[PDB]
Amino acid sequence: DNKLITDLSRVFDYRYVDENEYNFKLISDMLTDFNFSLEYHRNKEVFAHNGEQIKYEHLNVTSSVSDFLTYLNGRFSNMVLGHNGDGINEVKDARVDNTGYDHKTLQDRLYHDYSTLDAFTKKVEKAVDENYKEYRATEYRFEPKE
Amino acid sequence: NKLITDLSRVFDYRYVDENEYNFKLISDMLTDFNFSLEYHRNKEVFAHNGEQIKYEHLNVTSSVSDFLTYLNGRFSNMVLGHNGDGINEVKDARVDNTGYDHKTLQDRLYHDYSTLDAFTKKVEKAVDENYKEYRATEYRFEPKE
Amino acid sequence: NKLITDLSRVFDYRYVDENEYNFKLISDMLTDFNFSLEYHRNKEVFA
Amino acid sequence: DIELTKKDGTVIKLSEYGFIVNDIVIDSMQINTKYQDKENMNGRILMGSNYISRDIVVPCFCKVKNRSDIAYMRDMLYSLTTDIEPMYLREIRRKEELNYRFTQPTSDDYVKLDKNNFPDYEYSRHDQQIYVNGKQYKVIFNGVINPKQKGNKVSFELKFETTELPYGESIGTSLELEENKKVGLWSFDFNIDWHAGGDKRKYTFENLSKGTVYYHGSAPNDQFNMYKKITIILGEDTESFVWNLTHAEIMKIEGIKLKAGDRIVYDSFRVYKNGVEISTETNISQPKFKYGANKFEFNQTVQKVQFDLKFYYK
Amino acid sequence: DIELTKKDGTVIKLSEYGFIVNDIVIDSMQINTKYQDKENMNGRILMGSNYISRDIVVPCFCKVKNRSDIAYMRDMLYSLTTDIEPMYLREIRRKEELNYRFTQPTSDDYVKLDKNNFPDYEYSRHDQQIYVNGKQYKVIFNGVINPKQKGNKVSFELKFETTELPYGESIGTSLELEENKKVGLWSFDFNIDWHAGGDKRKYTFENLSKGTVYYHGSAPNDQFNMYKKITIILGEDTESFVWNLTHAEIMKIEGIKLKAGDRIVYDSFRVYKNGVEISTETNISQPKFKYGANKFEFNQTVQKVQFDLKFYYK
Amino acid sequence: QEPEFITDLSPYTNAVMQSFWVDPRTKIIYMTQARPGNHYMLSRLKPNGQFIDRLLVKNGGHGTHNAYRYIGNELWIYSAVLDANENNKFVRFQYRTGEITYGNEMQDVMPNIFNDRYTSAIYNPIENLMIFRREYKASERQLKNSLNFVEVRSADDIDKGIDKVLYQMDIPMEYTSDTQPMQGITYDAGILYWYTGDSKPANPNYLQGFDIKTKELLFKRRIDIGGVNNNFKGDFQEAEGLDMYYDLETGRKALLIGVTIGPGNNRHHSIYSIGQRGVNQFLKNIAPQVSMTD
Amino acid sequence: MKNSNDRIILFRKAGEKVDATKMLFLTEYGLSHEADTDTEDTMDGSYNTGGSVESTMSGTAKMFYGDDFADEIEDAVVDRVLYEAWEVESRIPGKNGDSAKFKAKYFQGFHNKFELKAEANGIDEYEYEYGVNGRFQRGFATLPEAVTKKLKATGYRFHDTTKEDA
Amino acid sequence: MKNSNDRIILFRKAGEKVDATKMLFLTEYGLSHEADTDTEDTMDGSYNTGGSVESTMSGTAKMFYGDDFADEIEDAVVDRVLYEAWEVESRIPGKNGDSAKFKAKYFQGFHNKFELKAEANGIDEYEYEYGVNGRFQRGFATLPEAVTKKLKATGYRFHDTTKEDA
Ligand SMILES: [Fe+3]
């Protein structure tokens, strides 16, 4: 849009004040427009980036997401499967848990998942309990010995 | 390189130059930010890390890097993962992780997930109660007493 | 935002005080915009 | 680049009258020295040294639509400027070398033209020129010739000259500095604090034996022709009344008896005992403000002092 | 190339104030002759010949960021320089025509820019300019015009002029030479031995009828306006007191009786018998130091002589 | 946060409170003022303000701030003093009522390495650090565009002689100029608080707390603790030295700030604080305010 | 990697509220931005203070019957008419919210020279040199419909034989 | 025994803290170091006292779509912006503890002239003449990564037939 008034008057008058005023109004509108554009890019704007602008690194394998999707579609359209039985492929597919690391047995997978969740929630509860204890101590601190 | 929010208190050429440089810098910095965002949005390679972007299925939230690694792990397991005795695998999976053989795999999975959900909801109720007690002790305003 | 678009029309220190306050707001705003942008770029989760 | 002139009874500016100007150049003040050479001594005594005159020069040209009109325009210039009547000149500058801005050649957003056939680069309100400084000059004209270059363009070479005192008289008193009523007339050339009511803005003190003054003017206000004017409510009865001052001389008022509530208007080399009927026989000495701190010292805690003056520059 | 000015109450230098200078050129001293032509004789008598004035010239220009500011800057110049107040000018030079140094164009080791838009070639502390010599000049200003070349560049042509005596007054006395306390103010233009306390540095002698002095100044200190000032503890009682000197006249003090421990302050053409109540009726003759060896001869072995003076140059 | 009043100081000498520092393990305030000449007073007082005693450092410079270290119940004062108008010495000593001057009673610390320029120090006991403020000469300043620079270093290193200049940082002019002189410093948690003031009302005195690690500006607020808004006793308020009050127990750090108010020949030194939920309360409740009666 | 044909010239008379006028059949073209260094050198250094520019733009053309524009250029030269002109490069459109606009260089001045030439059985060409008032301004410009349709300039599309069409 | 292609040009705007910018597609090039002999000749001898140099460097180029640098040069010429430029000869590396650095000639000034030209169905080239403030400085300089990767400039590596690749 119209640029700011870089050069001001060299005498204090209504003109100098109006110059600073107009410059500040233009700055407010510029900042609001930029913040709106940023929120629109961050939340509402569709087809913002075209895939290739994204990183994807795993096991020291860096590559773009738009290339890795093509690689996966290729591997899938080249994947071969046999009618091993009445659910063998199905169970073999279920043997993973959301992060790769194919388990040797579905039972091992379920045990590992349940164990991870138990350890996580139990560690959470321990953190809760020690935080509550710390807060009660800090609040009701009555330690006349120190 | 940055603004001067410490203006001279004598109204001289110093002050006027400070104000002028200030507005010039604001314009320059703003147009630089706009161009930077545009470069980010259009041409910046590897603008975002893959862990960031969210992939929302039904009632499910996850990144794209995790999801892609999971797809790749699925492919790898289905291809080079040994298989066999699936019926025995299922009938053995029927048992839970404490030493009790359920009747069916779905019932076992349901019991396990319900146990976890109940434990988490109990923890959550304890957390909410603890937080509410802390608030009522901290921001206490009871002119009844 | 929150800028004073009605400056004192009088040759007094209130003018420079509100000018300095406006510039402090502008500086803080540009800085947090740059920080938010950097966060969105290479630190934010579910950007 | 307008060369404003405030005459006794009117205000004029040239570019309003179709008179562009090329520039304004203001000489410094012609220092007349007064040396005396001792007969056989390798060095000459300074009897004195003194500012005299600040000769201004302003070449201005003018374009018109037809050759005849030149005559009219020229006469207007003379009738408008060449005035033995001591005028007050004010200089004007621009803040930028303005250009034409971007437009669109789509049978729209065409360009403007001034009353004179020129391209109006002044699109917005904030384009046109400004009183570059809050001062003036007491000025008189000297001889001009009018070479007519081709067409309707003719040049002139105004040679103005200072009238009374070779100084940059600051417009507006020091009380308009005190009471921030009048707006304009205060440029950043004067290093003036914003703290109105604070020190180095105030020339209105109360109930003090001694106080402080910041004369923002680089040139010294020792000359009486300057509008240095003091007025004091004396606060306490007395028979004699001395007040001292730095960068100036001592002042007495002896031999006349006064009273507390009576006020003295102390004009330059002049003393109104009570506003009229001047009693100025007592210690004819005039005060002198040089620059910055001009500390005064009364002797019996006047209940009021206040004094307006004009700032002068070199 | 800074043109330092020490005024009565302050110190100023132009390049601090955004005022570059092109150069400084210092004329010699205008020799006013006094000849008389005999009527029919192929030759004219020299009545006298005498130095008068050392006219300095300094053209200085200035750049600013915008066209308006020119005005302010110009006014500053006038308010900063054009002073009838006798000032003390000190010249400055550079030791080298400095260039920009080698750097690396690797998004690093970029170049600096001054407050004015220029390239800072002064990378290290030892780059900037120096007081080229330990002397000054008593100086006053003469008229200037300000042609504005394009943009924000405007030139000025200062024309300074000597005030009292056309000489290169050396700053600092001869006692600062004696006591090596003050540092600076001693340039190699003065051929000064390092042997502090040795001969040709000392102006503080004891218990001597006759002694030796090396006046390092090429110009002669015969003029009283120079700060030649002697003070002597007479050592021995007497009724009369003569002392002779070479490159000068004989001096007597007859008709007044003195005492040994009493001291005489012998200022230029002036005699404090005991520091006040000047008894200067006796043989009004002033001493004159020309250059190099200025041998004095007292008559009764003063217990102390010491005298500070200022070195003057042509 | 907004500062909170604690106390006023009652030194029996009329001058400005150039700085102050309270001690945790003793509840005693040492306040430094600069007397006419290079000499300077430091008054040891109670928390309420009552006068215990004083010491006069002769030729001790302005004494803008001094570091107070505790080495196993032994109070060392690191200070800046010059002797015989030679140069600035950074010197250790012990408190003693009356008079002192550089000589046998005061021992320098590694003189050869930083007695080339004006230097002063503060002490942070939590990290056991000795933050050295070190001024610049005029010639170096011409290129640096700055007056002073702050070095971090460790007190054990200073003791056993080894020098380390980790975390050095210049200060731009605008934060130390004539209208914004230094007037106080204190380090805490990788953050250097720099409190400046103009000794003039409506020239807003405030602090400019920034970071030393990465050489940035963290924050910059305004301060009007002289009293009611733009109406202070006398005609001027002046900012003064800082202090970070720790505690041997309940390690709750608070930031104490000195202000000096009132007309020309009569001063009022007050201590405000920004606290950490109880620090200021305990500080003022150590001992009561003096009253004419019980 | 840029064919000059791409660049396009637009003209207009300042105090005329109409759309621009392309300049057809210009063979050569040139745009010189000279400078005069207002430099002042100390006796112990050197400095540049300012610069007075002498920009200008030169062009040729070929005088086809259809357009009378060359006559307008000539009238400008001899009558000293102010003319605003801009080269608007085709095939370089706007970036942000700008697609029909095209990169440009807009400048105003007076035509300080114009001169034609012609030989036997030869097209009659001419050469004009145009000043530039001060500094020019760059900025994305849109073209007028007229210039757009001219830009296409397709030639003798497929007709048919034996009287179907001329 | 030295092909010009080897020599490389780097530019940068002074008050900009960024890495240099190569100048692509320059056909010609020249670097003139004139001198003005401040000589004073006695009536019984001769002498040279000093010399005022008038160094400068000229170059052409070809205005490819990709880079907007020529626009920067032009903005300089018209706006009098100070630029620092150095030719850094490739294939002449450092000798002692210097391998990535390359011989160079560093100098700064203002672009005193710039002028393009263009003909029908022809690439649009231009010519710039750049002053030199005082004496230049020589010194082994390192290049920025960008310039290094550009220097390679391999062309249309082996692709494949029947749809494996474009
Ligand atoms: Fe994004």
Three-state SS string over B19-64 comes to: HHHHHHHHHHHHHHHHHHHHHHHHCCCCCECCCCCCEEECCEEECC
Rounded to 5 degrees, what are φ and ψ at F67? -100, 140
Q: Tokens in use for E222?
A: 């015969």
Closest Cα in chain B, distance from residue F211 (Å): 16
- Any G CB within 8 A of D102 CB: yes
Nearest CA in chain E to G42: E22
Contact D104, D157 (CB under 8 A): no
Give SS3 for B66.
Answer: helix
C-alpha closest to that of H101 among H49, H148, H39: H148
Q: Quote the CA–CA distance of E14 and F293 in Å, as a whole number.
A: 65
Q: Are D308 and D173 in contact (CB under 8 A)?
A: yes
Handedness of CA E69, E74, E75, E77 (dihedral sign): positive
Phi-psi region of E78 (alpha: psi -120 to 50; beta: other; left: phi over 0): alpha
Inter-residue contact F89 to F82 (CB < 8 Å): yes
Q: Which secondary-structure segment (H or E) carries A136?
A: helix A106-139
Q: How far apart (Å, rounded) are the C-alpha atoms in residues D102 and G139?
A: 7
Helices B13-42/E69-81 angle, 10° precision: 150
How far is ligand 1, taken at its centre, from the CA of residue B48, in Å? 7
Q: By CA distance, what is C41's nearest residue in B?
A: B48
Q: Using the beta-carbon criterion (under 8 Å), do D33 and E146 form an inter-chain contact? A: no
**Contact F201/D at CB under 8 A:** yes
Mark whether C and H touch (3+ CB pairs within 8 Å): no
- Among D63, D97, D109, D110, most G C-beta atoms within 10 A, so best to mutate, is D110
Kindly give, in sequence order, each residue whose CB lies less than 8 Å from that of residue G49, ignoring residues fewer than 6 positions away: E61, E63, E149, E150, E151, E152, E153, G38, G39, G40
E strands, chain E, are: 4-7, 10-12, 25-37, 44-62, 87-90, 137-142, 154-162, 204-205, 208-211, 214-215, 229-233, 241-245, 251-253, 263-267, 270-272, 292-293, 296-302, 304-308
- 8 A C-beta contact, residue F272 and residue F6: yes
Edge to edge, the sheet with strand D263-267 lists D204-205, D304-308, D229-233, D263-267, D270-272
| Cα A61 to middle of ligand 1, angstroms | 23
The pair of three-digit structure tokens given for residue F270, joined into one six-digit string: 């007050």
Residue G137 has its nearest CB partner, among D101, D104, D107, at D101
Pairs across B and D, CB distance < 8 A:
20
CA distance E20 to E155: 10
The amino acid sitting at C37 is L
C-alpha distance from residue E289 to each of B95, E214, E280, E308, E309 (Å):
122, 9, 21, 12, 10
Instruction: Identify the CA nearest to H56 among candidates H93, H109, H92, H116.
Output: H109
Closest CA to E231 of E201, E269, E197, E274: E274
Q: Using a CB–CB cutoff of 8 Å, tell me whether C11 touches chain A.
A: yes
Suggest the residue from F142, F143, F144 to mutate for an interface test with chain E (most E CBs closer than 10 A): F143
Question: Which of D95, D133, D184 lies nearest to residue A7, judging by beta carbons?
Answer: D95
Residue A145 CA, ligand 1 centroid: distance in Å:
57
The SS3 call for residue A18 is: helix
Mutate to test the interface with C, among D174, D175, D180 (most CBs of C within 10 A): D180
How many Cβ atoms from other residues are within 10 Å of residue E300's Cβ?
16
**Nearest CB to A28; choose among C3, C6, C47:** C3
Question: Which residues of C are annotated binding-site positions for Fe(3+)?
Answer: 40
Which of G154, B107, D31, D72 shows the shortest CA–CA distance to E163?
D31
Q: Which two tokens stand for residue H15?
A: 């008050």
Note the resolution in Å, 1 decimal: 3.7
If one counts every other C-beta atom within 10 angstroms of the C-beta of residue G161, the result is 6
Beta-carbon count within 10 A of D153 CB:
13
- Residues from chain C contacting residue D180 (CB–CB below 8 Å): 10-12
CA distance E120 to chain F (A): 10
A in contact with E (at least 3 C-beta pairs within 8 A):
yes
The token pair that represents E151 in the structure block:
């943009």
* Partner chains of H (3+ C-beta pairs under 8 Å): E, G
Chains that touch E (3 or more CB pairs under 8 A): A, B, D, F, G, H
Side-chain-side CA neighbours of residue C10 (13 Å): 12
State the distance between the two ends of chain H, measured CA to CA, in whole angstroms.
Answer: 40
* Pairwise CA distance, residues A66 & E13, whole Å: 66
Asked if residues B44 and B58 have their Cβ atoms less than 8 Å apart, the reply is no
> Tokens at residue B5, please?
């929010």
State the smallest CA–CA distance between residue C18 and chain D in angstroms: 12
E155 touches chain G (CB under 8 A): yes
* Chain E residues with CB-CB distance to H18 below 8 A: 107, 110
Q: How far is CA F267 from CA F20, F185, F272, F284, in A?
A: 15, 22, 16, 21
CB of F86 less than 8 A from some CB of E: no
Within 8 A of E53 by CB-CB distance, chain D residues are 44
Chain F residues close to E129, C-beta within 8 Å: none
Q: Which residues pair with A89 in a beta bridge?
A: none
10 Å Cβ neighbour count for C27?
20
Please report residues of C whose CB lies closer than 8 A to that of B62.
none
Binding site residues of C, as ranges?
40
- Method of determination? cryo-EM
Q: Which residue of D has its CA nearest to F204?
A: D195
Are the CB atoms for H119 and E83 separated by under 8 Å? no
Window B:21-80, CB contacts with F under 8 Å: none
Say if residues D283 and D209 touch (Cβ distance below 8 Å).
no
Count of A–E CB contacts within 8 Å? 6
Q: For E74, how many CA atoms within 13 A lie in the half-sphere containing its CB? A: 25
State whether D191 and B12 contact (CB < 8 Å): yes
Instruction: Kindly state the tokens that stand for G32.
Output: 């010189």
Q: Which of F67, F73, F65, F66 is nearest to F26 (CA)?
A: F73
Q: How far apart are CA B33 and CA B40, in angstroms?
A: 10
Give me D286's structure tokens. Answer: 């005039």
Q: Which chains touch D (3 or more CB pairs under 8 A)?
A: A, B, C, E, F, G
In angstroms, the CA B35 to CA D273 distance is: 73
Type of residue at A7: D
Looking at residue G35, its amino acid is A
Pairing of strands F98-100, F51-57: parallel
The DSSP letter of residue E78 is: H
Q: Quick check: E100 and H108 in contact, CB under 8 A?
A: yes
Pairing of strands D44-62, G137-138: unpaired
Distance from CA of B144 to the nearest CA of A (A): 23
Alpha carbon dihedral E51, E54, E55, E58, in 10-degree steps, equals 170
Q: How many angstroms is it from A65 CA to the middle of ligand 1?
A: 15
* Residues on chain A touching D130 (C-beta within 8 angstroms): 9-11, 15
